[PDB]
């Protein structure tokens, strides 16, 4: 939630997608790596699980 | 003929815009044909020739010509004495078959200027102005009330043109519609089964369907025939609602009586002996 | 620009008659009327006034094509009354109901309504 | 509308709508496309009804009074460009007023529309009979000694005139010099295309179709306010094509236009979209699955089946009929083989290849077969020697 | 004029028409000629060529004129019949619950061409005159052709219902002396069928009278349809709660049954099927279960449809679409496949990274649990987009290959032809057959017949 | 002029000889709506034989998930060969491994 | 490019109600109420205004309103 | 000077990247136009991946 | 063997429920452009004289 | 007779009416844009 | 036939012979004859390379060479 609060604040406060990546909450994944990950469709499924 | 019924009228409600009424004891074909006249056959005045002197605006010329034709025009006092263009002896135009409008605007101001219906002036006497802002004391008057923003202009643009409005009727172009809309409804409880409802409980009841107030929904009667048609004619504003109805019926009378004269013309010229 | 001028939908041409009558070759006391430049508005109503009459054996109309302004009205009457007179009466009666409707509407407006003008 | 500043752009060919609207039912992905900023179609009131059959099989009955009130009207611009080439040793092209006394050309089209500099000015109406630019090509300088002068001797014509957009108005004319340093012009022509029988339209679900006829407001079928449909699409377009999404969109749209807030349509959620929409539409006051009691325009009687009506964003496409028509009686002949032209753009004639030949064979209409493949494209008479078959 | 289009795949692609000049710029042509030219008015343009003498005009009028092109010599059946809305509108009109009052009957009589001139007596005299739909259809039938059956409609109880009292059941269509006695007309009665009303008409009345029959059926049935109406909305796409429960329960049972077969397979004791590896035995078995699952709920949804489902009315006339579509919109879409097998393992042993390695379950390998109406879940959508390609690609290939196979074939046989002593010979005058087709009959004049003596 | 030339015609390299497969690589940017352009810039092309090939580089491999558009490919002769990049997908510019 | 005079589906004039609408939204976040006060009952007249995009405003901003 | 390299529109080396939305509108350029295509001899040309 | 022909025309097709099975509506402009050679006989001469 | 030729941005006539090269006095631009005709046309509001 | 620098009008010497490109015909205004074997500068006509790959032009049976700089190709 704090990251989302920064994105809403981004409307005037300095912030970027790059900051969001530097937090290490999001990553880039290519098709070769994508073969070995265990990727889940929605937070819903990953929690309800 | 003895089998012609006297129908009957009742006006439920009247406003500056709407006219809402019931016709009873008549035929559907009459109701439907009369609804069609309200659209197509009732004549009115709208811009028909646009001559563009100068146009520096960000809208192309034919676009200005389009918006401009479509704007509404009062006609009630004058739509009758005016004659049709093609019928008129004059070459091109004249005071007797058309009325002239002039528009001249330029943006000399730093703030964006709007071009509106009031800025359009009738060279013809103010018997036939644009719809909005004249004799006013109108509670419909809100903010700008320009009736139509013909275009917007930034500092430097200018617009000069001439227009000739003419009498014509809706069959020929939609700019000549004398109606905002035309409601038409008959047999609200679906007694006559002209439609067949699958699971009739799933349908709502109109303001005319209140009769049994109950939820019994549609009692059948096969010995019936369509009667008592409900109307709500709504004015575009360019011609007041009752005048639309009275002019429609007269025009229909004129069209019918004329067909009778040609049918008479068949018995007078080329004597009706063919059949 | 292969589109027709819009006035032609309703304006009569100088080389065409408003109405034409032709006899049927099959059955007696039938007749065929051709009405030029006139659509369902006139046609549908004249069909109904003819159906209202008790001596008409058959009445109908057809607009042959959407793109061609013209309708035909075929009528068949009993072996005593002529189809032309039935057509004459059908309009005249229709003129009478509409005049009475216009009269009744106008008087109905004459009710103490205060937005008549 | 394809970019904002189009007006100062001499794009060689363009189409813009008068009134674009953003769609009532939109995907969230569309915010990031800016498809709100520059949309491509109009929210039509559609009825999926059978009616008079002018909408059978991939056509539509479209409302004529709506096209009068400017429905889907568009403007068309073609920019023609012409160059004044110096072209080497002893020739020259010149922008000027061509006269039949002074140049080798004399093509039948009228030169009078031109200005005295050879190039028209904005606002004058043009057509396929008009010349837009008077270019001439001085060529022989005088390389035909002794009085082969007479007239029109100095220069050939090759000025450019309208084939295609065989009517319209000149939008803009621009004179400049390009990268060679030659005098260069672009002149732009504006035309306005009213949606007519033969224009191809498509809704958003991959159902394209041609406008089969148009009826005026009087004739459409109607209901309540008499909100007559701007289109009637055939019911048969749905079942074998199962474009159910198309059917939900009217329904989502009906709630969105009425409630007054642009509707969601993003593909994957738990918004129970069929039920939840049906319940909302009914609370407002309609049959919960959208059907309305319609009446026919011809006789006013009710139509016994209730008809599914409501809005759908539709597209008018770049395929419009007046550009696509074509025909030829006798025309230009290419002296490679001297049979009719293939460049339709230059009054071509359609092909009659081996398979069409094969059917005439299969009918057994030999006389018509020799006619299409001979007398009506390419007849010739040659004399041959009876001793030996050489045409020498 | 001779009208054509490309690709011209057979002799009926180019036929003679008479022109009639109209406003606006498209060739406007009869709706019924849509299936011989394989045309759609979704932007397909067609081509016209004009004859330039009386001699070619004579030759066209007699050989290649359209009305003569009705029954194709390829398979002695109609090349063209009553299609789309009219075909749906005919079914709906012929149901014997349809009644017409004096006013509408006269208008339909009015749209008919070759009408006798005499107005038929209404099948119901009192309390008020009414004509049944069959009755007005019966004016449209030319002269007096005859055919039983020629329906094979869904109706009744195939194989044993007609043998159960002949309680007329009204389904089966019977026409006698040019009057429709009973039954409902559909694509099997009116379509390109071997025994359709249209085929018999060509034979009995002659091609000109048959053309008037096509025009008549369409202007008149069509005109009715206008007052009656037709449509399809979300109301023709939903079923009740109970059916919806039954569908989910049928699927929940079948999925548990697949997990059950997977449990048996991992135990190593399944016992394979003949001529197959054990995976094939397994794959053949799960495929049988999922197909049976689709068909069970498919048969449940067709039952659950009400009488008034317009969607069922289009399917039954045979106008457009079919039973499987109802299955997919109302019920459950089912196993997708590509190259005749379930969705391949693209990644290491998996279809998508959203699943576990080696997961033979239905959903994980390409079964769509949903209907088009509820919407597809994200994986199902992509496995559905995969099922979408195989058909688009197949289309682009088949067009190239068949164009080539046809040209080569015509190019061989072109010079063969029946000579005036009726032996069939090619160009160098060699004999192909002593009699054409071994009997010397025409292909457009033959019919299917039963041989009594094989009793 | 060399860069000017190759980029304009759409050819590629030596012109005298090299132009057999890598032909059609530059194109005039289609501008019919706003979408055609965004879609055009975000297009990608697989090279292929031409005029009759039938195989597996035309169907929708599973690994395109999240990468290339499910459904969005020319309805014509080159079905499945010229593809369009999904909405979020991205491309590496690459750098020294050192 | 500016709201059309008269709604396509029926005819009720609608350009006049545009300037009024931007004022109401500035005052209240009630799109329902805004459309209601303007009198746009039936939804064809409503889609007209609700779905319009006023491109003209960005378009006017170029200086060269001179060519 | 060795030659002329075609710039691609609105990239870091094409002057449009630095200007703001009002400035870009002042240069008669669309603010929403995406760039990333070369301009050659009057024609806008895009390279296909 | 695959020649370009004269007297040829091409437009879009749209449906028309009123035509007979073998009629075709032809745009008026295409009908004006393409011609047929009638030969004058002492019967149609008055009709052709009008044309 | 003059051939006007308004120029870009300067918003003034280019005064060129002869064979001399096109270039607007004072203003540094060299694109022209031939001015509207005084000749009347007409437009129907249909 | 060497006296045809565009003259062959049977009844009267020529004054003008207009080219009606669209009909493929040569017309003589003050009467009405048609004299034509029509060509519209063979240079537009061979130009039937179009929808097929035109970037490479397989139809180019005629290179430009640019002779007006030189003389001898
Ligand atoms: Mg097709
Ligand atoms: Mg089809
Ligand atoms: Zn006058
Ligand atoms: Zn010899
Ligand atoms: Zn409205
Ligand atoms: Zn300047
Ligand atoms: Zn002469």
From Swiss-Prot, chain A:
It comes from the Eukaryota. It is found in: Nucleus. Component of the RNA polymerase II (Pol II) core complex consisting of 12 subunits: a ten-subunit catalytic core composed of POLR2A/RPB1, POLR2B/RPB2, POLR2C/RPB3, POLR2I/RPB9, POLR2J/RPB11, POLR2E/RPABC1, POLR2F/RPABC2, POLR2H/RPABC3, POLR2K/RPABC4 and POLR2L/RPABC5 and a mobile stalk composed of two subunits POLR2D/RPB4 and POLR2G/RPB7, protruding from the core and functioning primarily in transcription initiation. Part of Pol II(G) complex, in which Pol II core associates with an additional subunit POLR2M; unlike conventional Pol II, Pol II(G) functions as a transcriptional repressor. Belongs to the RNA polymerase beta chain family. This is DNA-directed RNA polymerase II subunit RPB2. The gene is POLR2B.
From Swiss-Prot, chain B:
The modification Phosphoserine is found at residues 124, 257. Pfam families: RNA_pol_A_bac (PF01000), RNA_pol_L (PF01193). One of its GO terms (biological process) is transcription by RNA polymerase II. It is found in: Nucleus. Keywords: DNA-directed RNA polymerase, Nucleus, Phosphoprotein, Transcription. It comes from the Eukaryota. One of its GO terms (cellular component) is nucleoplasm. GO terms for molecular function: DNA binding; DNA-directed RNA polymerase activity; protein dimerization activity. InterPro entries: DNA-dir_RNA_pol_30-40kDasu_CS, DNA-dir_RNA_pol_insert, DNA-dir_RNA_pol_RpoA/D/Rpb3, RBP11-like, RNAP_Rpo3/Rpb3/RPAC1, RNApol_insert_sf, Rpo3/RPB3_RNA_Pol_subunit. The keyword Nucleus applies. Residues 203-226 are annotated as: Disordered. Core component of RNA polymerase II (Pol II), a DNA-dependent RNA polymerase which synthesizes mRNA precursors and many functional non-coding RNAs using the four ribonucleoside triphosphates as substrates. PANTHER family: DNA-DIRECTED RNA POLYMERASE, DNA-DIRECTED RNA POLYMERASE II SUBUNIT RPB3. Belongs to the archaeal Rpo3/eukaryotic RPB3 RNA polymerase subunit family. This is DNA-directed RNA polymerase II subunit RPB3.
UniProtKB/Swiss-Prot annotation, chain G:
Belongs to the archaeal Rpo10/eukaryotic RPB10 RNA polymerase subunit family. DNA-dependent RNA polymerase catalyzes the transcription of DNA into RNA using the four ribonucleoside triphosphates as substrates. Common component of RNA polymerases I, II and III which synthesize ribosomal RNA precursors, mRNA precursors and many functional non-coding RNAs, and a small RNAs, such as 5S rRNA and tRNAs, respectively. It comes from the Eukaryota. One of its GO terms (cellular component) is cytosol. Zn(2+) binds at residues 7, 10, 44-45. It holds the Pfam family RNA_pol_N. Transmembrane segments: none annotated. This is DNA-directed RNA polymerases I, II, and III subunit RPABC5. InterPro entries: RNA_pol_su_RPB10, RNA_pol_suN_Zn-BS, RPABC5/Rpb10. Component of the RNA polymerase I (Pol I), RNA polymerase II (Pol II) and RNA polymerase III (Pol III) complexes consisting of at least 13, 12 and 17 subunits, respectively. Pol I complex consists of a ten-subunit catalytic core composed of POLR1A/RPA1, POLR1B/RPA2, POLR1C/RPAC1, POLR1D/RPAC2, POLR1H/RPA12, POLR2E/RPABC1, POLR2F/RPABC2, POLR2H/RPABC3, POLR2K/RPABC4 and POLR2L/RPABC5; a mobile stalk subunit POLR1F/RPA43 protruding from the core and additional subunits homologous to general transcription factors POLR1E/RPA49 and POLR1G/RPA34. It is found in: Nucleus; Nucleus, Nucleolus. NCBIfam families: PRK04016.1. The keyword Zinc applies. GO terms for molecular function: DNA binding; DNA-directed RNA polymerase activity; zinc ion binding. The keyword Metal-binding applies.
Curated annotation (Swiss-Prot), chain I:
DNA template strand binds at residue 4. It comes from the Eukaryota. It is found in: Nucleus; Cytoplasm; Chromosome. The tandem heptapeptide repeats in the C-terminal domain (CTD) can be highly phosphorylated. The phosphorylation activates Pol II. Phosphorylation occurs mainly at residues 'Ser-2' and 'Ser-5' of the heptapeptide repeat and is mediated, at least, by CDK7 and CDK9. POLR2A associated with DNA is specifically phosphorylated at 'Ser-5' of the CTD by CDK7, promoting transcription initiation by triggering dissociation from DNA. Phosphorylated at 'Ser-2', Ser-5' and 'Ser-7' of the CTD by CDK9 (P-TEFb complex), promoting transcription elongation. Among tandem heptapeptide repeats of the C-terminal domain (CTD) some do not match the Y-S-P-T-S-P-S consensus, the seventh serine residue 'Ser-7' being replaced by a lysine. 'Lys-7' in these non-consensus heptapeptide repeats can be alternatively acetylated, methylated and dimethylated. EP300 is one of the enzyme able to acetylate 'Lys-7'. Acetylation at 'Lys-7' of non-consensus heptapeptide repeats is associated with 'Ser-2' phosphorylation and active transcription. Regulates initiation or early elongation steps of transcription specially for inducible genes. Belongs to the RNA polymerase beta' chain family. This is DNA-directed RNA polymerase II subunit RPB1. The gene is POLR2A.
């Amino acid at each position: 939630k704090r990251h989302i609060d920064q994105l809403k604040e981004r409307e005037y406060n300095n912030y970027s997608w790059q900051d969001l990546v530097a937090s290490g909450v999001v990553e880039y994944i290519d098709t070769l790596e994508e073969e070995t990950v265990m990727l889940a469709m929605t937070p819903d499924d990953l929690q309800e699980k | 003929m003895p089998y012609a019924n006297q129908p009957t009228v009742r006006i439920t409600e009247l406003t500056d815009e709407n006219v809402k009424f019931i016709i009873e004891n008549t035929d559907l074909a009459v109701a439907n044909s009369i609804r069609r006249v309200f659209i197509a056959e009732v004549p009115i005045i709208a811009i028909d020739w646009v001559q563009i002197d100068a146009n520096s605006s960000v809208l192309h010329d034919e676009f200005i010509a389009h918006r401009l034709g479509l704007i509404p025009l009062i006609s009630d006092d004058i739509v009758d004495k005016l004659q049709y263009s093609r019928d008129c002896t004059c070459e091109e135009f004249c005071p007797e078959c058309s009325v002239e409008f002039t528009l001249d605007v330029r943006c000399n101001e730093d703030q964006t200027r709007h071009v509106t219906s009031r800025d359009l002036i009738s060279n013809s006497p103010r018997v036939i102005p644009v719809t909005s802002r004249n004799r006013d004391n109108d509670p419909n008057d809100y903010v700008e009330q320009d009736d139509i923003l013909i275009v917007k202009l930034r500092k430097g643009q200018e617009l000069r043109l001439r227009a000739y409005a003419k009498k014509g009727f809706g069959k020929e172009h939609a700019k000549w519609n004398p109606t905002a809309g035309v409601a038409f409804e008959y047999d609200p409880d679906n007694a006559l089964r002209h439609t067949v409802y699958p699971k009739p409980e799933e349908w709502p009841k109109s303001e005319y369907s209140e009769l049994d107030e109950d939820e019994s929904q549609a009692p059948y009667d096969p010995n019936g025939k369509p009667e008592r048609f409900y109307y709500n004619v709504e004015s575009c504003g360019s011609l007041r609602p009752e005048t639309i109805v009275l002019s429609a019926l007269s025009g229909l009378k004129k069209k019918l009586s004329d067909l009778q004269t040609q049918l008479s013309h068949e018995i007078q010229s080329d004597v009706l002996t063919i059949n | 620009m292969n589109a027709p001028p819009a006035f032609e939908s309703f304006l009569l041409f100088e080389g065409e008659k408003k109405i034409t009558i032709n006899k049927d070759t099959k059955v007696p006391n039938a007749c065929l009327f051709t009405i030029n430049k006139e659509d369902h508005t006139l046609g549908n109503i004249i069909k109904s006034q003819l159906l209202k009459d008790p001596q008409v054996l058959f009445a109908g109309y057809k607009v042959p094509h959407p793109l061609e302004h013209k309708i035909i009205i075929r009528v068949q009457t009993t072996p005593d009354y002529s189809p032309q007179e039935a057509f004459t009466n059908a309009i005249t009666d229709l003129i009478s109901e509409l005049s009475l409707l216009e009269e009744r509407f106008r008087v109905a407006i004459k009710d103490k309504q205060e937005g008549i003008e | 509308v394809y970019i904002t500043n189009f007006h100062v752009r001499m794009d060689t060919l363009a189409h813009v709508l008068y009134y674009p609207q953003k769609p009532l039912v939109t995907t969230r992905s569309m915010e990031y496309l800016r498809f709100r900023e520059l949309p491509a179609g109009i929210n039509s009131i559609v009825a999926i009804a059978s009616y008079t059959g002018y909408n059978q099989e991939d056509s539509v009955i479209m409302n004529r009074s709506a096209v009068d009130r400017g429905f889907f009207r568009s403007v068309f611009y073609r920019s023609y460009k012409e160059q004044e080439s110096k072209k080497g040793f002893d020739q020259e092209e010149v922008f000027e007023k061509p006269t039949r006394e002074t140049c080798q050309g004399m093509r039948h089209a009228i030169y009078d529309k031109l200005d005295d500099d050879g190039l028209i000015a904005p606002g004058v109406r043009v057509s396929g009979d008009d010349v837009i630019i008077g270019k001439t090509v001085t060529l022989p300088e005088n390389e035909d000694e002794l009085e082969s002068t007479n007239r029109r001797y100095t220069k050939r014509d090759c000025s450019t005139f309208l084939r295609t957009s065989e009517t319209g108005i000149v939008d803009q004319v621009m004179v400049t010099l390009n990268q060679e340093g030659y005098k260069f012009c672009k002149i732009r022509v504006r035309s306005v295309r009213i949606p007519q029988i033969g224009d191809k339209f498509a809704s958003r679900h991959g159902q394209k179709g041609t406008c089969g006829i148009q009826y005026r407001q009087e004739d459409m079928p109607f209901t309540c306010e008499g909100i007559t449909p701007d289109i009637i699409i055939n019911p048969h377009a749905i079942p074998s094509r199962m474009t159910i999404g198309h059917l939900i969109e009217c329904l989502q749209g009906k709630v969105s236009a009425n409630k007054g807030e642009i509707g969601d349509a993003t593909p994957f959620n738990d918004a129970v979209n069929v039920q939840k929409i049906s319940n909302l539409l009914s609370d407002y006051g309609y049959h919960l699955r959208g059907n309305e009691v319609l009446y026919n325009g011809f006789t006013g009687r009710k139509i016994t089946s209730q008809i599914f009506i409501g809005p759908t964003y539709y597209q008018r496409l770049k395929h419009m009929v007046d550009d696509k028509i074509h025909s030829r009686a006798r025309g230009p002949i290419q002296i490679l083989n001297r049979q009719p032209m293939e460049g339709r753009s230059r009054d071509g004639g359609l092909r009659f290849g081996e398979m069409e030949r094969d059917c005439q064979i299969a009918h057994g209409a030999a006389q018509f077969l020799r006619e299409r493949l001979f007398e009506a494209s390419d007849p010739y008479q040659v004399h041959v020697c009876n001793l030996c078959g050489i045409m020498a | 004029v001779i009208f054509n289009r490309q690709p011209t795949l057979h002799k009926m692609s180019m036929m003679g028409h008479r022109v009639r000049i109209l406003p606006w710029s498209t060739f406007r042509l009869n709706l019924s000629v849509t299936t011989p030219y394989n045309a759609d008015f979704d932007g397909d343009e067609m081509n016209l060529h004009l004859p330039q003498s009386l001699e070619t005009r004579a030759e066209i009028q007699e050989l290649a004129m359209v009305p003569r092109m009705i029954v194709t010599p390829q398979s002695n059946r109609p090349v063209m019949g009553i299609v789309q809305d009219t075909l749906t509108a005919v079914r709906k009109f012929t149901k014997r619950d349809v009644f017409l009052e004096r006013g509408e009957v006269m208008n339909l009589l009015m749209f008919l061409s070759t009408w006798d001139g005499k107005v038929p007596q209404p099948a119901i005299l009192k309390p008020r005159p009414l004509w049944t739909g069959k009755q007005i259809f019966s004016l449209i039938i030319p002269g007096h052709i005859n055919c039983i059956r020629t329906h094979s409609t869904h109706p009744d109880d195939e194989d044993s219902g007609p043998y159960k009292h002949i309680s007329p059941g009204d389904t089966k269509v019977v026409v006698e002396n040019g009057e429709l006695i009973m039954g409902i007309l559909c694509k099997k009665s009116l379509g390109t069928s071997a025994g359709s009303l249209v085929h018999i008409s060509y034979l009995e009345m002659g091609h000109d009278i048959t053309r008037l029959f096509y025009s008549n059926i369409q202007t008149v049935i069509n005109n009715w349809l206008l007052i009656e109406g037709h449509t399809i909305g979300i109301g023709d796409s939903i079923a009740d709660s109970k059916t919806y429960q039954d569908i989910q329960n049928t699927i929940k049972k079948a999925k548990q049954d697949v997990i059950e077969v997977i449990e048996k397979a991992h135990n190593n004791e399944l016992e394979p099927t003949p001529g197959n590896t054990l995976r094939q035995t397994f794959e053949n078995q799960v495929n049988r279960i999922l197909n049976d699952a689709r068909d069970k709920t498919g048969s449940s949804a067709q039952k659950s449809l009400s009488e008034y489902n317009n969607f069922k009315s289009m399917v039954v006339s045979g106008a457009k679409g079919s039973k499987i579509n109802i299955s997919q919109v109302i019920a459950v879409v089912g196993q997708q496949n590509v190259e005749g097998k379930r969705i391949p393992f693209g990644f290491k042993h998996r279809t998508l990274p959203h699943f576990i390695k080696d997961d033979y379950g239905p959903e994980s390998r390409g079964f769509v649990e949903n209907s088009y109406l509820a919407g597809l879940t994200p994986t199902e959508f992509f496995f559905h987009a995969m099922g979408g390609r195989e058909g688009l690609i197949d289309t682009a290939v088949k067009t190239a290959e068949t164009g080539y196979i046809q040209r080569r074939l015509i190019k061989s046989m072109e010079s063969v032809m029946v000579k005036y002593d009726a032996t069939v010979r090619n160009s160098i005058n060699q004999v192909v057959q002593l009699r054409y087709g071994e009997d010397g009959l025409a292909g457009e004049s033959v019919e299917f017949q039963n041989l009594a003596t094989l009793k | 002029d060399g860069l000017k030339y190759s980029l304009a015609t759409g050819n590629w390299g030596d012109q005298k000889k090299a132009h057999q497969a890598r032909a059609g690589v530059s194109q005039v940017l289609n501008r019919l709506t706003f979408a055609s352009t965004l879609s055009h810039l975000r297009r990608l092309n697989s090279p292929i034989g031409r005029d009759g090939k039938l195989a597996k580089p035309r169907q929708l491999h599973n690994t395109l998930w999240g990468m290339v558009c499910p459904a969005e490919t020319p309805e014509g002769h080159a079905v499945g060969l010229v593809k369009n990049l999904a909405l979020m997908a991205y491309i590496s510019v690459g750098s020294q491994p050192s | 490019m500016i709201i059309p005079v008269r709604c396509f589906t029926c005819g009720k004039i609608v350009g006049n109600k545009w300037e009024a609408y931007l004022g109401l939204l500035q005052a209240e976040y009630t799109e329902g109420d805004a459309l209601d006060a303007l009198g746009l009952k039936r939804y064809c007249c409503r889609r007209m205004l609700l779905a319009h995009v006023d491109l003209i405003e960005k378009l006017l901003n170029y200086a060269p309103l001179e060519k | 000077f060795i030659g002329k390299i075609p710039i691609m529109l609105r990239s870091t080396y094409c002057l449009l990247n630095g200007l703001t939305d009002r400035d870009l509108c002042e240069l008669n350029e669309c603010p929403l136009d995406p760039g990333g295509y070369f301009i050659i001899n009057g024609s806008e040309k895009v390279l296909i991946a | 063997m695959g020649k370009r022909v004269d007297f040829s025309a091409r437009t879009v097709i749209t449906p028309d429920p009123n035509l007979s099975i073998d009629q075709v509506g032809v745009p008026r402009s295409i009908a004006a452009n393409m011609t047929f050679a009638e030969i004058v006989t002492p019967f149609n001469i008055d009709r052709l004289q009008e044309l | 007779q003059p051939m006007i030729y308004i120029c870009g941005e300067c918003h003034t006539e280019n005064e060129i009416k002869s064979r001399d090269p096109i270039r607007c006095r004072e203003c540094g631009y060299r694109i022209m844009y031939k001015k509207r005709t005084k000749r009347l046309v007409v437009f129907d509001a249909r | 036939l060497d006296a045809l620098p565009r003259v062959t009008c049977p009844n009267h010497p020529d004054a003008i012979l207009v080219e009606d490109y669209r009909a493929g015909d040569m017309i003589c205004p003050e009467c009405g004859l048609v004299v034509g074997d029509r060509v519209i500068d063979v240079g537009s006509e061979w130009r039937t390379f179009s929808n097929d790959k035109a970037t490479k032009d397989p139809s180019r049976v005629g290179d430009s060479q640019n002779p007006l700089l030189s003389d001898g190709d």
